[PDB]
Every structure is written in structure tokens, then in C-alpha cells.
Ligand binder design. Sequence first.
Ligand SMILES: OC[C@H]1O[C@H](O[C@H]2O[C@H](CO)[C@@H](O)[C@H](O)[C@H]2O)[C@H](O)[C@@H](O)[C@@H]1O
Ligand SMILES: OC[C@H]1O[C@H](O[C@H]2[C@H](O)[C@@H](O)[C@@H](O)O[C@@H]2CO)[C@H](O)[C@@H](O)[C@@H]1O
Length: 322
Amino acid sequence: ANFIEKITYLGTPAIKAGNEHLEMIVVPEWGSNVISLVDKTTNVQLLREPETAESFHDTPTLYGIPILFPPNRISDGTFSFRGRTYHFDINEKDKHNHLHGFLYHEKWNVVTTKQTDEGVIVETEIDLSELPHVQKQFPHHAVVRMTYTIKENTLFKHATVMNKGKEAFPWGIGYHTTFIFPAESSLFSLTADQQWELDERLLPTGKLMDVPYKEALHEGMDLRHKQLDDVFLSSYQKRGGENQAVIYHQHAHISIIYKADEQFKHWVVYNADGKQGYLCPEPYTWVTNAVNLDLPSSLTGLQVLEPGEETTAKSSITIELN
Ligand SMILES: OC[C@H]1O[C@H](O[C@H]2O[C@H](CO)[C@@H](O)[C@H](O)[C@H]2O)[C@H](O)[C@@H](O)[C@@H]1O
Ligand SMILES: OC[C@H]1O[C@H](O[C@H]2[C@H](O)[C@@H](O)[C@@H](O)O[C@@H]2CO)[C@H](O)[C@@H](O)[C@@H]1O
């Protein structure tokens, strides 16, 4: 049994959808942000929700599931692709970067909803050629379609990126997924062995380094007194196995299994100062500043769509009760 219901989320239109296990709320106007994810059996919210519409706008990448296209930093907002140079708004002024892409602060359209025994689908979409200011920065006919499916106890979360233009473009995608993370009763684990070393501007130098506490990181570890803003290299590339973040709420015995396919080669993990009760295990298909690295694509995970092509990048959130 499953349902869709149109609602108002803090004065914005929104869509609630779900089954007997999980409910989502997606707000198309807020960059198609999946702002709420609720476990119906235990009745607990899993995502960091905003108090007021205003405080959501203050920081639109620190609530629910913000879409980062492309993710994280480009230095000086400048890169070159196939001879051609680009200039993106430098919205991060101290570090002199462009930060977090085009689509998190924009109006997305609902393409369609669909319901079968296979669970409930909501689809959203944005055509970048319909946003004049983005075209100044990035004159390409990129179209992004999100497909959200709740089925059994899982939210499947698929990004289809399409080139409907006449020139090839590099692209990567990331999510700023913000989970409620209580430092004293929450354990965290990630399939990662190495991380990207960063300069003062949170930009990759090019070098990789062993994660000292990698064992603990594999098994599940508390984050008490540990400030993270780290760009990890998914272990799957070298070792196979899983590609996932896991969060474990000790009180209610809830496991949140955040899976992602082979295209997601990096996870940025962010908890601000560690005293804010949240955590952002952010899977990216490409490393920070990927566009500006003279490094193999199988490492940076940089991708290219030629005219007429499309790719789908798959991730899921699984709630397990144990
Ligand atoms: O912004 C275009 C520049 O990209 C490279 O340099 C930046 O990115 C590096 C990788 O993160 C940083 O280490 C470096 O400090 C940044 O300036 C490229 O090396 C430059 O030639 C480009 O101008
Ligand atoms: O202007 C800098 C901005 O970012 C810092 O934290 C970032 C983090 O570095 C990124 O990797 C990103 O994914 O998460 C945060 C922004 O969403 C600072 O901690 C933050 O206060 C500041 O606004």
C-alpha cells in the first residue's frame, strides 16, 4: 500500500509520498530537496529539517537532501574543458571558490508520479537552458531528472543527467544529505581507506593519504570530539565490496544504510564542529575541483556527456530495524 499527497511545507508546495514503512517529502521549488524522511514503524524523522522557511534559505545545503550539480568547490570558479575556458560565480569569497553548483536554489518541475505494487515513484526535472544566469556561466543544454522511489523500506534516489545540446560537457553530481546525528548515541561507518589531502581552501593537492583510523571507520565509530570536513576516496575502486555510509542510532536500534553505485567515487563527510547534532555523508561522483586536476578520470571520477547522451547515477537510503 502506498500513497501520494500534495501538501504545504512551510508555505511552499510539496509532495508527501510513501508506504507503510517510509514517508518522504520533496519540495520541488527548493531545488527538489527531499526535506523529510520518516521511519513509520518507529515514527522518527531521519533528516535535518528547517525551523522556518527563512532559516532554510539561510543555508539551503544543510537540510534534507540538497542536490549538488556539480558538487563542492571549483577554484576561482574557473576551469577549462576541451580548450574552452569557463567562469562560474565565486559564491564562496574567503576561499575564492564556486561552491555547490547550480540546482540547489532553483525551481524544479514534477514530470510525473506513478504507483504500482513496486512502490511509489515521484519524478522531478530541471532544464539548465531555461535558467539565463546559469547559461552565462555554463552555456550547455544540460537537463537533470531525479527519480525518487520508495519501495519496501528503501528510498531509491536516481539522477539522470542528459546532454540535449550540441557540445560535450563535463559533469558530476553530489548530495548534501544531512542526517540527524546525535554525537552520544550514534555510530558511523564508511567504506573508505584513503582520503584527499586538502590545502587551506579545501581544494585537493593531488595527493592521497591513508586514513589512520580506517579500521574503526569500517566497523562503525563514534564521532565525539572529531570535526570532519573530509573528502574520502571510496574503497570500492581498489578493493571491491560495498560502497556505502552507515549510521547507527543506538537507542532505537535503527540502521541507516546509505548506498551508492560505482560512479560515486568520493564521500565528503561533514559535521561542522560536531556539536550541531547532524552529519552529512555526501556521496559525489567526482572529487572536489575534479575539473582542474591533471589526474586520471577513473580516480577523479570526472565524466563527459557527448550530445544526445545520458547517464543515471544510483543511490539509496535503507532503514533497518535491529
Ligand atoms: O582554477 C583553475 C586552476 O586549476 C588548477 O589550480 C587550482 O586547483 C588545484 C587543485 O585543487 C589547486 O591545488 C591550486 O592551488 C588551484 O589554483 C590549475 O593548477 C591551475 O593552473 C588553474 O589556473
Ligand atoms: O564558506 C565556507 C562554508 O563551508 C564550510 O563547510 C562546508 C564544507 O567545507 C564543504 O565540504 C560542504 O560540503 O559543507 C560545508 C558547506 O555546506 C564551513 O564550515 C561553513 O561554515 C561555510 O559556510
